[PDB]
Every structure is written in structure tokens, then in C-alpha cells.
Amino acid sequence: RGASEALAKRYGARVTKSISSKTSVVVLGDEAGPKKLEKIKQLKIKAIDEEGFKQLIAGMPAEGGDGEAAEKARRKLEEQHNIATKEAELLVKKEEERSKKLAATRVSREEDKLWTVKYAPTNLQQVCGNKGSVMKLKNWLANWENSKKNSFKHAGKDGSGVFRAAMLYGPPGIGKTTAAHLVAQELGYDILEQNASDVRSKTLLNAGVKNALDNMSVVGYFKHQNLNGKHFVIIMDEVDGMSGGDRGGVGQLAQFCRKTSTPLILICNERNLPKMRPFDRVCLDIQFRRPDANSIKSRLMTIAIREKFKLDPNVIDRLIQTTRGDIRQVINLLSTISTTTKTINHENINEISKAWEKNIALKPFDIAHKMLDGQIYSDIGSRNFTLNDKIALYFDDFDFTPLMIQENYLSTRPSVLKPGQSHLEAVAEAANCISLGDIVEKKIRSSEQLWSLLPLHAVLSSVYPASKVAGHMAGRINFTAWLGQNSKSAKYYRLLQEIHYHTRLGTSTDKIGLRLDYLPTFRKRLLDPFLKQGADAISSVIEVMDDYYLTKEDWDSIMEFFVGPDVTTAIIKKIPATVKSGFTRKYN
Amino acid sequence: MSLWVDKYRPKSLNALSHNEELTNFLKSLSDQPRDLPHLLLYGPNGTGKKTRCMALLESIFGPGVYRLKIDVRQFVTASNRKLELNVVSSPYHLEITPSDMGNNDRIVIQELLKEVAQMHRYKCVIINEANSLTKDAQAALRRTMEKYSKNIRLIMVCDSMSPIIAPIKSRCLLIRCPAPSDSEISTILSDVVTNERIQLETKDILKRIAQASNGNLRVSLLMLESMALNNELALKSSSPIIKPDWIIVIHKLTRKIVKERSVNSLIECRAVLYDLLAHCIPANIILKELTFSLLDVETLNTTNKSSIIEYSSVFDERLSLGNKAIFHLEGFIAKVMCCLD
Amino acid sequence: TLSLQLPWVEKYRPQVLSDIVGNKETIDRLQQIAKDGNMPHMIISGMPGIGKTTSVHCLAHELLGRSYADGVLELNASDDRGIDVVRNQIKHFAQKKLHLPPGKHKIVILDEADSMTAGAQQALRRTMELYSNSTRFAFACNQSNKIIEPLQSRCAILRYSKLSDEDVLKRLLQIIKLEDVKYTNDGLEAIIFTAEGDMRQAINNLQSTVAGHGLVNADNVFKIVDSPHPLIVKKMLLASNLEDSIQILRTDLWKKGYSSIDIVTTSFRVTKNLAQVKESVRLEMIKEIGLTHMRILEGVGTYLQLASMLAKIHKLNNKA
Amino acid sequence: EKRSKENLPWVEKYRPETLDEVYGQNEVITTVRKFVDEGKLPHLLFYGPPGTGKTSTIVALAREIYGKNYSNMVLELNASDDRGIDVVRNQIKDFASTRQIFSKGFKLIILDEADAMTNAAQNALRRVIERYTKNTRFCVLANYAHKLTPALLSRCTRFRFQPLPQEAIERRIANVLVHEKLKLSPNAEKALIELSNGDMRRVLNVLQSCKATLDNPDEDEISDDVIYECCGAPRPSDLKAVLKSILEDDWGTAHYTLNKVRSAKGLALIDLIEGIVKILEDYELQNEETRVHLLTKLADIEYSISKGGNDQIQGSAVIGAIKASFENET
DNA sequence: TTTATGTACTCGTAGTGTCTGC
DNA sequence: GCAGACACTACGAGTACATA
DNA sequence: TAGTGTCTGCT
DNA sequence: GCAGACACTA
Numbered sequence A: 001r002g003a004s005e006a007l008a009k010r011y012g013a014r015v016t017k018s019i020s021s022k023t024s025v026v027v028l029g030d031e032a033g034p035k036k037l038e039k040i041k042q043l044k045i046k047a048i049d050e051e052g053f054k055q056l057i058a059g060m061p062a063e064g065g066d067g068e069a070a071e072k073a074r075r076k077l078e079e080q081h082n083i084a085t086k087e088a089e090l091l092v093k094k095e096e097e098r099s100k101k102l103a104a105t106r107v108s109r110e111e112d113k114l115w116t117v118k119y120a121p122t123n124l125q126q127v128c129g130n131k132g133s134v135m136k137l138k139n140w141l142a143n144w145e146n147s148k149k150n151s152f153k154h155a156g157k158d159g160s161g162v163f164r165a166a167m168l169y170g171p172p173g174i175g176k177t178t179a180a181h182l183v184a185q186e187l188g189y190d191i192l193e194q195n196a197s198d199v200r201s202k203t204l205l206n207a208g209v210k211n212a213l214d215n216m217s218v219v220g221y222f223k224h225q226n227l228n229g230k231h232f233v234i235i236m237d238e239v240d241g242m243s244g245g246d247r248g249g250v251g252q253l254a255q256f257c258r259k260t261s262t263p264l265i266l267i268c269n270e271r272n273l274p275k276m277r278p279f280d281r282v283c284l285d286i287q288f289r290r291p292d293a294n295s296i297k298s299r300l301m302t303i304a305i306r307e308k309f310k311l312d313p314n315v316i317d318r319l320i321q322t323t324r325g326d327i328r329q330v331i332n333l334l335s336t337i338s339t340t341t342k343t344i345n346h347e348n349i350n351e352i353s354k355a356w357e358k359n360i361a362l363k364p365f366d367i368a369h370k371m372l373d374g375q376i377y378s379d380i381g382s383r384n385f386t387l388n389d390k391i392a393l394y395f396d397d398f399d400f401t402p403l404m405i406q407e408n409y410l411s412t413r414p415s416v417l418k419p420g421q422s423h424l425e426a427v428a429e430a431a432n433c434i435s436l437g438d439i440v441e442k443k444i445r446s447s448e449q450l451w452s453l454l455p456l457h458a459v460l461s462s463v464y465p466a467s468k469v470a471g472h473m474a475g476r477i478n479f480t481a482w483l484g485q486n487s488k489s490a491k492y493y494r495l496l497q498e499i500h501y502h503t504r505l506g507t508s509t510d511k512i513g514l515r516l517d518y519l520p521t522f523r524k525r526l527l528d529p530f531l532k533q534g535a536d537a538i539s540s541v542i543e544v545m546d547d548y549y550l551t552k553e554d555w556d557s558i559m560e561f562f563v564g565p566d567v568t569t570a571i572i573k574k575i576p577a578t579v580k581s582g583f584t585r586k587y588n
Numbered sequence B: 001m002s003l004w005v006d007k008y009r010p011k012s013l014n015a016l017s018h019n020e021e022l023t024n025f026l027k028s029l030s031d032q033p034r035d036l037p038h039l040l041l042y043g044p045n046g047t048g049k050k051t052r053c054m055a056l057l058e059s060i061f062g063p064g065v066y067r068l069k070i071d072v073r074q075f076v077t078a079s080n081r082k083l084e085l086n087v088v089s090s091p092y093h094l095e096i097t098p099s100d101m102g103n104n105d106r107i108v109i110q111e112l113l114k115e116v117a118q119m120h121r122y123k124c125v126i127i128n129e130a131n132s133l134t135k136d137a138q139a140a141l142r143r144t145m146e147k148y149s150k151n152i153r154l155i156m157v158c159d160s161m162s163p164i165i166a167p168i169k170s171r172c173l174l175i176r177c178p179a180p181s182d183s184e185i186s187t188i189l190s191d192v193v194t195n196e197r198i199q200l201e202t203k204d205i206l207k208r209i210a211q212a213s214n215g216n217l218r219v220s221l222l223m224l225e226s227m228a229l230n231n232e233l234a235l236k237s238s239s240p241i242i243k244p245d246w247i248i249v250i251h252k253l254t255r256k257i258v259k260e261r262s263v264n265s266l267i268e269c270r271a272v273l274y275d276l277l278a279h280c281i282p283a284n285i286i287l288k289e290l291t292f293s294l295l296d297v298e299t300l301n302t303t304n305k306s307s308i309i310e311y312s313s314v315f316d317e318r319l320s321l322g323n324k325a326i327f328h329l330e331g332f333i334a335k336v337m338c339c340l341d
Numbered sequence C: 001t002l003s004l005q006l007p008w009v010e011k012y013r014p015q016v017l018s019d020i021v022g023n024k025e026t027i028d029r030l031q032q033i034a035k036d037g038n039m040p041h042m043i044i045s046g047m048p049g050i051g052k053t054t055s056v057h058c059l060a061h062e063l064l065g066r067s068y069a070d071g072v073l074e075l076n077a078s079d080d081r082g083i084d085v086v087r088n089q090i091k092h093f094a095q096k097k098l099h100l101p102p103g104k105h106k107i108v109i110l111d112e113a114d115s116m117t118a119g120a121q122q123a124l125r126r127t128m129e130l131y132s133n134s135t136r137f138a139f140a141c142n143q144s145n146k147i148i149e150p151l152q153s154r155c156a157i158l159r160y161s162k163l164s165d166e167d168v169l170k171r172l173l174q175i176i177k178l179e180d181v182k183y184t185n186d187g188l189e190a191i192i193f194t195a196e197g198d199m200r201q202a203i204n205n206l207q208s209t210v211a212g213h214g215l216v217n218a219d220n221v222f223k224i225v226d227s228p229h230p231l232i233v234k235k236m237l238l239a240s241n242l243e244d245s246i247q248i249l250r251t252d253l254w255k256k257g258y259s260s261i262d263i264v265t266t267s268f269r270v271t272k273n274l275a276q277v278k279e280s281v282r283l284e285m286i287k288e289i290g291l292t293h294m295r296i297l298e299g300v301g302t303y304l305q306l307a308s309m310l311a312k313i314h315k316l317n318n319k320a
Numbered sequence D: 001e002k003r004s005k006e007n008l009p010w011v012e013k014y015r016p017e018t019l020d021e022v023y024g025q026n027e028v029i030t031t032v033r034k035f036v037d038e039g040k041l042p043h044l045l046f047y048g049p050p051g052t053g054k055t056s057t058i059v060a061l062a063r064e065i066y067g068k069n070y071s072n073m074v075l076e077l078n079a080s081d082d083r084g085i086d087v088v089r090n091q092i093k094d095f096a097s098t099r100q101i102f103s104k105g106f107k108l109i110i111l112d113e114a115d116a117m118t119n120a121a122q123n124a125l126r127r128v129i130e131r132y133t134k135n136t137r138f139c140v141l142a143n144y145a146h147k148l149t150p151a152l153l154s155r156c157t158r159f160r161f162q163p164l165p166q167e168a169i170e171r172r173i174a175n176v177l178v179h180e181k182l183k184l185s186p187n188a189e190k191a192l193i194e195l196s197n198g199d200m201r202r203v204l205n206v207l208q209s210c211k212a213t214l215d216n217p218d219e220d221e222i223s224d225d226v227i228y229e230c231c232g233a234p235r236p237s238d239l240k241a242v243l244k245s246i247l248e249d250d251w252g253t254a255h256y257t258l259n260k261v262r263s264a265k266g267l268a269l270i271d272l273i274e275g276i277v278k279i280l281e282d283y284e285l286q287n288e289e290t291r292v293h294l295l296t297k298l299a300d301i302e303y304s305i306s307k308g309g310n311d312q313i314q315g316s317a318v319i320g321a322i323k324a325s326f327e328n329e330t
Numbered sequence E: 001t002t003t004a005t006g007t008a009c010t011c012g013t014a015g016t017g018t019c020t021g022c
Numbered sequence F: 001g002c003a004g005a006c007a008c009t010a011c012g013a014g015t016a017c018a019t020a
Numbered sequence G: 001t002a003g004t005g006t007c008t009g010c011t
Numbered sequence H: 001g002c003a004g005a006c007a008c009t010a
Ligand SMILES: Nc1ncnc2c1ncn2[C@@H]1O[C@H](COP(=O)(O)OP(=O)(O)OP(O)(O)=S)[C@@H](O)[C@H]1O
Pocket: A115, A116, A117, A119, A120, A121, A126, A127, A128, A129, A171, A172, A173, A174, A175, A176, A177, A178, A179, A269, A299, A327, A328, A331, C150, C153
């Protein structure tokens, strides 16, 4: 599939990842997802096997003929080349402009600079992708004074008026910093930027930008028509560098989001970290994403024309796919390759891709989805994705991987079932190996701290259980429920201890026997009088409650310990409020 | 007090009508209290072990053992993970429980016992839930009780003493507390119902209460009180025997396992188990009750029952050797469903 | 006390990019960067001993020999690297005004950068972004996954592969002519086999052979250094009869003074990296080998545990 | 110390002081002697089991290089002292950078028991070794090579210390007996060889305990009975009798024989299991399954013995495992 | 998030000493 | 000479990592 | 204003 | 895998 896709893209053919009604021809193999198998039959789409693919290459003439789809694709491709040539001499004329100006100044350093710096977007029209996010940021910034006049009470149609500060988050290399700086520069604001190079703890944040919330640029007066030239746009790049739960400045930046008299902008990479939790509902969240290949294709054509080296236009898609939408790293790749290899073409693309592949660590959900696939445990699949690859895949998120495997290993339809083995048998084997991995995990995280035993836990808790039940997920990748239930159980244990030691005097029973035996009896001494006679037994319930040194808080705590048919949440709800109101007042 | 289980608890050795031979043994031990060694009472749950311990303390020290208060001691582990534990102290003795963090139960055994071992001539320390120690508090306690013995003594109360390590069982005088028969439970319940006011027709209902508790004084007493309260203090011949909500949930889970043996049944069982563990119910008791509820189903033959008990033993070992309790229970249920289907 | 001669590892370290052997394309790219001079930020990664840091040093030397002392800051794991001791020093070096030839930039070599703290890398991000006009960075780490994503984004990734037998053989012959030492082809192939792509290991073993026996033959080479235990463990796991594996284990590991924990870890690594057998067989072997590993770690390290592990391997292999 | 020698254990009283007194590792000693004579000492790495003569060899080598006052000329670091990366950054860096304060030679750094060193310390040590290799040599002594980083293993020449053979143990025993005026029977010598298991320290400790065992240390000769009584090890005759009773007789005779053998001299069950395993490895078993059953069951039994439990149950389990495994023979 | 030691790092604070000044 | 005024080392609290 | 192509968070 | 939102094209 990978090699055929390389040959499919070898002749300028778009290779979509999903089957559609407008799809022209589908190359059929042996086995794939059932959704594709049912989609091809009903829509009567043209199907050509691999034997017809070989004669397709020789039979199809160049340019794709005069077909309606082929003609439309060519003129769009020519337009992409046309706009590439139009902007190629735009900087060349600019380069001649600055060189003449520089020569005059000398009488009366370039071409030795990183390509990601010289080819940086001069204005907002030179960016590639995320047009909507850029315009959203610009509309928020240009209307910040209007929201300041309205005291941030009512926003507009977009809803950015209420948010005093905007936030930028997205993957590396896509242009958050450049977009923010260009939007700040275009409107005429004065950019006040901080970063991880200098300390940004609580103390110097209080002694630094804190006094800049309602003060203007000293250079702003001396730089002057401009109406926004004497203000601050706080640009904190790399918010993730505040690696401090308490001594860090994340809560301090939250306090700035609370109170600030000037536009403020944040740039980070990943938002969903527990460290950066206090930023959940604070700022106009502007999300950037991996841009589509067309804009980068045009920009790379401009760069290649300007740099006197040629790469095939179809190669750009493979370069973007290899680098995972990192434009700056694409320019770095071009600069590194162009030193000796001046021809980036069909022959060098495979070596370039396998040499510059980006090994990005996967998220827990992607790890679970990748691990419960029946293809990688097949004979052909496992050769490409070896066992060490699966071990590394676990080790990307080893703290969460076994939990994510255990959460949804029985929610998937298996495709690696042994002959004569039912799904339940595979689930039983996976559960047994999960228990063994749990034992190994307890041994690892103990007094001995046998951290050299981690790969065995990796296998036993993620690789072996998944290799028995791998295939297609019936539902969706679900987050582990053990964390929330564990927190709930710890809280319930804390309450159980509190009430147990409140009734410790006179009770010869430990905390375990309190819940199993004592607590069901307390319900029929502290709730049934409320049910069978109402408020007429207010004193009797208080008499029992006071006898065991039980407070009003303990009364509500006991009711939540019950399960099944003895759940008292509905029983208390059905009790009238007048009856319950008197019980609280009499105790107080 | 308000509950009948704590209202008629005996306060002396002569006030016990529960085990004659055990009470005679305790009287023999209290006859010469000076050379009393470190004790270890073990037996089935709910039989009255701590009642025996308090009665023995009263026989050795005197009235005032039951005039006890609660004080809180501050303990600091590694780093600044502050832990609050309250000791239920008293004149003439001390009471401590592993109710602290299971991985932090060593620090209380070290510091508190070294503090109270500073200086008739000794103080008694009672350790409830002694089977819940994690092999390190016991390791410290070995030398803690071997070195300091002329000023401190231990009464180590536990059930199913297998987790207790060999040296601790070596330096502890083991005392066995058997559960009573049906007649003794019925006699105690009859004493309760004649000390209080309950209308009863035929004492067969008391025999049924004794049968349901399965040799448990606490469960039988609480069941009697609950049934009297539900029946408006007038017990009937066909009064419905109550069961804890946990028992009903476990029985429903067993019926679900027996009836349907699919994987959606397995995820439903996972949800039920998650609720049960989240509601303060130990995993080993859960596995034991699930096993003995599965073995009570009459539709199974001997092969399925043997496989169920074998897997139950294996996963009981796993539960004792592991910390993620839901993992082993889910594995056990999956194995049982694979065996039955 | 007598002084010691320079080891062959450091005596014959390359000083130019032509003497280094191995990845021809990467070295040619480095030489074209040498000619052009506009060296981008680079990360160099690979397994130890294949010419990572010597290539960086050669590139820096040829780029600015006259200013190697002035405009090259070689910080490393031996030096104290943190948040402040890195940010202050690197910022002072990057802002430092030093006059280069027009195509030259100051080079900050972060040798052994995989052990760096994440916050230090976060500060380095903005350092490289701001001062790329004057200074350039050159990382060199064994494991490139430790470096955070933005640094790998703002860098040119240069991956180094383990050398084939031909390149190590060529370097060995060159050093042999330079040192004028007698040798036999069998001994040279033994040295290459023992090195396993590591040039430094090959040089060390060759020097040990020369200084201990004088003639580089198979007998002397196998006398001073044993065959690698991964290979003997691999052929122990892949043997047919249980008796064959048992006797291989005993003779070649137990009587050779190899620790049981080392044998178990080597077996785990081989089974993870083993390829001919089926995946499920490897998973079962890893499970039981890990059980044996737990037994060894708990304190029971004997010959009987290893023999039982091999017996379980054979009980798995013969399919009940 | 105090009162000079004769108040030391024989392990420390007979530590080699010259490279000619280190027996067994003839190839290693000859190679390092050639290294120091030719004037080229690389970064050494001594690997091997405990008691094989690693730290003795490096101490004798340093003494040969420098002299009597080698302790002040050599920085010896061990797991007893703190060896964090601050130590590598300050103490090792200063010792490698500075000149010799007492002579005009090179610096020697001995990283004794370096397998207990953190990963970051070894990572720093890589650069420290490469930077100052011109006038500073590193020696690394380790029992486990899996705890050392692969780059550190690459930087250091590896010398493997093979377990002490027959001749070396016999020569050291002869030297000790000559020094202590002690006598020893040849069968007792073979018993001590068997109990050595490649450990010279065990030999020296057993010799000291057996000299203390004799009623008069003079004019009484150590016999194999003295060795087996002092060490508590089972005699080969006892092991053969137990195995014969298990393999030939019924359960009552086998159980009675094992109990009698254990209770006659207080034999331990793990020692009997090890002896039985050593005897059974020499057997010509017909089936491939007898070996599997024997090895797996005996490993489980010895693991349970290590964890502790009931000795009678474990002994009956041993008898049953052996009999059931040998039932697969025919 | 739980996890249980040991290591390494980072920060903040409290003492601890020395240099200016009157 | 005495009281600050400073920069300095040292101690304590907290976070993060632990196999390739 | 409505069909795909594709990147992205689910705790 | 299950939506869910952002685009290009129609
Ligand atoms: N959308 C884009 N169009 C064109 N060039 C781009 C684009 N995004 C990035 N670049 C190039 O990449 C260089 C640096 O981009 P940055 O904006 O610094 O990346 P980033 O979004 O800040 O990601 P970080 O901050 O490194 S995680 C620019 O100078 C451009 O050369």
C-alpha cells in the first residue's frame, strides 16, 4: 500500500484517504475495512485491479488527456505555478531595492541566513494555512479597545469581546509566533514579549510585567498617524516553560487574565496538560492546526525558484506527510538536502523520507488505537512494526498505557483470533496477563524500586493483552475509568474513617465492619423514621445521632455508602422539604 | 448504646457466656498477670475477640479500661506528606490500628511504640486489623516487642492470621477464638429480646437469624435489631430475613454471570464491580462472596465448581500479591464466564 | 612512575572530514556545508562509536580554525548544565560580538544533549530563534527522542547508521599501515566481528591484541576478549535439544563467570530483538523469561532457575 | 586497624600485595603486566563474579605502578562513598585535570563497584574519560555489566575474571596451610574445592572456621568430616543415599530416609536440593520431558524454600517431584 | 492524580560574613 | 566603633524521572 | 447553503 | 474508533 501510493503519486494523482461518491476509480486488493467494502458496491464506482493498474500507466498519455477533471486539475496546478512565479521576483525586486539602498548608505548581512528567517512571512498574506484563526485573532485585537470601552461585559457575534486576552495553541512550526507578531505589528501596537530565556516565576512576574498592565511605551512617544503605538500587547511565547505547580507563574498569568488594562496574548503548544489546567475558561482560545499541502506547495515552489534548485511538485505532499505539517522543518530539510543533492525527485524521495521521519511521541488515545490493531500482529504487519516498536509505543506514555489497554480491550471486535478460539477466551487470556502485569507493576513501584523490570511490565500489561484481542474497535477509544473511581474510593474511605472515628467510642468494630454491618442498620434508625412517620420522629433521630457523636455532616455522608436496592438518594428526595427543614434547625 | 449490638456487650470475663474453655484460659492468664506474654487472638470475624481482649484488660488492670478517650498524633513520612492518625487511648493501655496508609503503617509502629516504650508495671497495646500490616511494620515490631518487653505488652487482634509473618507468630502466644453454634447465638439473642421488649411467637425466627449470620455475633445482633424495627418491634414467624445491599448486588452479579456469558455481560460486571469497590468494600471479601455465591448455584456440575474454586484460589493469590483490585476481579469473572460457557 | 603512550583511539582521531569513514552521504553533506559555511542547527544521533562528536569537532575546526578558541562553546554532560548556568552562558555567548568571515557563525556544541533538562531546552528554543544570525547550535546525542519536539523542529536532523564491515575494515587497515604492525586476516575479521560496528571498540581490541601478543590472529583476539554474550545467548535460545541449550548455558556462561541477572537480561533483549520465530512465541518466551527475571531479582539467583527457564522455553517450542 | 595482622580475618589477612600472588587469572595478569611494562595502560574494565580477585588485582597493579604510597596517588571511589554527578563534576574532574602532587606519573582513578552508579554519573564520566585520557586512566570494577551504560562499556577495555580453577585454589590453600602450620587431607581439599564454587573468600572463611573447629590447631589434621561438619554441607554419601532411596524404594522408605538424613546432622533442605540437582545433571535421562519436569518443579520448590514455609511439606514435594519426573522415563 | 526510594533540579529563604559610612 | 547594606553559602520545600 | 478531505480532542 | 470543526468545491 505504501509503495503503490508512492507510484500513484508519481504521476500527479490525488490519493484521498476516504471513499467518496465523486471518486473516479478505486484500486481493489484483498481485505480492508468493511465500510469501504459496502461503499464501493452500492455507488457502482469504477474498480480496477492491480493488473489493470500496470497497463494504466503505459496506456495513459501525459498531462492526463483532455478530460474535464484532468483539465480542471491542470489549470489549478498552472495557477499554483503562476502565483509561484509572480511572488518569486517580488523579493528579488525587494532584494535589488535594499541592495541599492544599502550601497547608497555605505557610500553616503544577506545570503548567509537561515532559510526559515529570510523567507519568513513579511505580512499576514504570506502565511500558509490557519487563515480563519489568523483572522479571528486580528478581529479580536482590532476590537479590543471597543470591548475596553464597554467594560468587557457584552461581546459581539464572534464572542471575543468578553475575553480580555487571547490564546494561541497548536503544533510546532505552523506559525503561531509569526502570526501573533504580524498581527501586532500591522495594527501598530508595541510588542512586549517574554519567553523561557528569562525567569518568569511569581516574584519577577510581580516585579516585571505587573507594572506594565497600565503603562505605555517610552519608545512609543519617540516613534511618532499611529493611534495604537503607545500600548502593550503582552506576547508570552512558550507558556509550557512555566514548569511549576506553585512557584510557577501559571496562576499569576491567570490573575493577569482576571485583571489587565492592555491586550495580552499567550502562545503555547499543548493546552490539555494538568499543569496548565487553570487556563480552561480564561481566554479566547484560538487553535492552529497543520495546514493543507497546497499553500506549502506554493511557498516551496517560490523558494525553489528563488534558490535555483528544482523539486517535483508532487514531492511536496510526501515531504509534508513525513514532517507531520511542520513548515519550518520542511524548510530546514530543503536547505540541508539542497547543499549536495540538487535534484529532489522520484528517486531520492524515499531515502529523504526515511532519513528525516519525525518520531513524535503519541498521545494515550492514539497509543491505544494503534496498539489494538489486528494488522500489526499479523505475519506481514509485524515485520514492518517489530516488537521493539511496540515496546517504544508503550514507553511513550508508560504511565497511562496499561490503564488505557485495560479500559477498552474487551470493547473491540477481534481479528487475531486463533482457529477455534472464541472472543471470550481471548478476553480471559488478556485479563490474566493484565493481572500478571499488575503484579509486576506493584513489584516495580515498591520499596525495592525494581525499575529495570519495566519492559516486562510493558509486555505483560500492554503488548500481550492487545495481541490477543486486536482488531477493529466496536465502539470508541474510551479513557480509563480507574482514575475517577479510584479518587471516589479514596474519598469514600476518608469519609468512612471520619464517621468510624466519630462513632469509635462504644463500638467494637473496625472500619471494614462499619460499612458491611453497622451502616445498613443506621439507615433504618436514621432514615425510616423520616419515611414512615416524617417529622414526628425528629427527636428520636437526633437522640440516636447524638448518641454516637454523629454530626449533621455525617448524616449526609452515611447515605452515600449504599448500593443497589438500598440507594437512599431517591428516598431523601421524596421527603418533603418542610420535614427536612426542621431536622437541621433543631440540631443547630 | 442506641444500637443493640453495643448495648449488651459484656464488660468482664464472668459476664461472657460465649466460650467456656476460652474464658477459662483467659482467667488462667489473668490469674498471674505479671508474666503475661504477648498475645495474638485469631478466629472468624465477629465472634467477640476484642470483647475478650477488653475483658482480659479489665481482669488484669481493673475498671477504667472502658473509660477511654481519643487523641490525635501527628506523624510525618518522607517528604512533607502529612498524615493524621488518632489513637484511642485510655488509662492502663493503648489502642492502635493500621488504619493509616497501608504503605505508611510502618512509621506509626516505629515512632509511637518507641515513644510509649520510654517508661501493673507495663502498658498494653492493642493492634486491631493486625492482618492488614504490610510485612514492614511487622518487621519493625519484631525487635520492638523483643527488646522492650518489661514495660510494654501486645495484644494483637486479627482474623485469618496467614499474612502475619513467621517471627511475629513465633513471639506471640496464639489464642484461638472459635465461633459459637446456633444454640449460643440464639441464647444471646433471646437475652437481648428479653432485656428489651420484642413481641415474638416462635423462636424459630431467632434460629433463622442465627443461620443467616453464619456464626457472627455482630451480624446476628444487627439483623435482629433491624428486623424488629422493620416489624414494629413484633417479630413474625415468616419475617423476611434481611441481607446487606452488598450481598444483594453480589447475588445479582452472580445471577448475571450464570445467565448470560457474553462480553457485554462482562462490561456490565465491570461497572457493577467498579461501583462495589468505589463504595468501601474490600476486594478479597468480594472475591470470596462471589466464589461462594457461584458455588451455591444448583445448575452447575462438579467440574465447573472445581474450576471455579481453582481459579478463585489463583486470583486470591493474585489479589494478595497485587494492588489494582479491579484487574484481578475482572480476570476472575472473565475466566469463570469462559469456563461456564 | 612512567608516563603512558597515547591510546590509539585518541591518537588516530580524525582531524578532517575526509578521514572519517561510514555514512558517505552525511559526510558529503557535512563537507558541502563546510564549503558553503552556512551551517544550520543540527542534531546528530546514532549508536555509540560511529563518529558523532568527532564529525562535529572536525566541522567546527575546518569552519573556523583561527577562532575555534574564541567562537566555539563546547558544553557537555561533564560540565554543569541546568537552567541558569545554561541560559546565562549561552545568552552571553550568542550576544557576544565576534567578527567572523562572512560565511561563518559561532558554534555552540551541545555534546551529549539527551540528558538535558526540559526547561533548559525550552530556554534554548528562544535562544536559537533569536540569535540564529550570529550563533549556530550542534547537538549530538545517542537517543534523539529525549530532545523536545520544538528543538527537533528548529534543527536539521542528521541520522548516523552503524558502519558496515567494509568501512571498519578500511579504517583498521589504514591504522595498521600507520602503526606498522603484523596481522592475519583471520584476526582482523575476528576484530570486526567483535566490534559489531563500533569503531572505538575495534580500535581498543586491536590495540589490546598488539600490546598483549603482538600478532593480530584469531587465537590472540579470542584470548584477550571473548565472543559477545548476546550471540551465545541467541544460539542458546535457538538450539533444538534441551540438553544442547543446557550445556551451552553451563559451559559458555556459568563457567565463564557471567552473572545470572546478566544472562536473563541478555535473553530478554535477544528475544525482543529475535526475528526468525513467530511473534506469539516471542511474547510467550518474554513472559516466562520475565517471570524468571522476577525470581532472580527477588534474590533466587542460581543455575537451577536458568535451567528451568530454558526448560520452559523448550516446552513452549515443542508445542506441548 | 589495631595490633597489626594476626587479628584480621583470613579474607583480609591474605589479600594479595603483588601481582605475582594473584592466582587463576593468568591471562589477565600477564596482559596487564605487559601493559604496564610497555608503558601503555588503557582504560581497564574488570568484570567477573565476586571473590575472583578484581580489587586485589587493581590494588596490586597500582602498587606496582606507584609504590607503597599508592593510596595518596590514586583516587579510589566505591559505592560506600556518595558518587552522584556532583562528585563526578567536582572530585573526578579536579583529579583528572590537575597534575600529580607526589610524583611525575599519570593519574589513576579506580571506580570500585561501579555497577551501583547512576546513569547521569556515567554519562558525565563518558566525557570526563574522553577529555582527560592523555594523563588520567580510569579503572572500572563491576559484577554486573547490565547496570553500565553501553557507551561506558565501549570506552573501556573489558577484562573478564573467570572463576578460580582447581590449581589456583590448591596453590592458595597450600600457602595458607604453610603460613598457619595447618594440615589438611586431600579428600578434605576436594570437598573445599566443591564448596568453593569459584569463590576464594569462601575457601578462606571455611579454613578459618575449621581451624577454630579442631580441638587443638596443632598436630590434628583437617578431614572432610571437619569440613562438612563446620560448613553444614551434605556429604556426597548422604546425597547418594537420599537419591537412591527416592528413586528405588517406596514412599515410606524414601520419607524415612530423607527425615533421618536431615535430622542426623541438621542438614538444610536447599543444600540437599542443590546436591541432588548437581548429581542429576550427570544422569543419562532417556526422555526430554523428565528434565523439563525436574527442572521446573525443583525451581518452584527452591523458590518456595527461599520464601520460607514448612520443611516437611517441601521435602515431601521434592520426593514427589523426583519420583513423578522419573516415572516418565519408562 | 494513585503509585514509594533515591536522585537531580529549581527555587526561595535564612543566616553569615564582609564592605561603606559617620 | 556600630548599624546598616551588601553578596555570599547553606538549608528546606517542591517537582520530575525511573530502559535503552 | 450543501458534499467530501483532513486535522483533532475524548480524561 | 467517534464525532467535531475547518476548509475547497459545487
Ligand atoms: N504558515 C507559515 N507559512 C510560511 N512559513 C511559515 C509558516 N509557519 C512557519 N513558517 C516558517 O517557520 C518559521 C518559524 O515559524 P514559527 O512561527 O516560529 O513557528 P511556531 O508556530 O512559533 O512554533 P514554535 O513556537 O517553534 S513551537 C518562520 O520564520 C517561517 O519561515
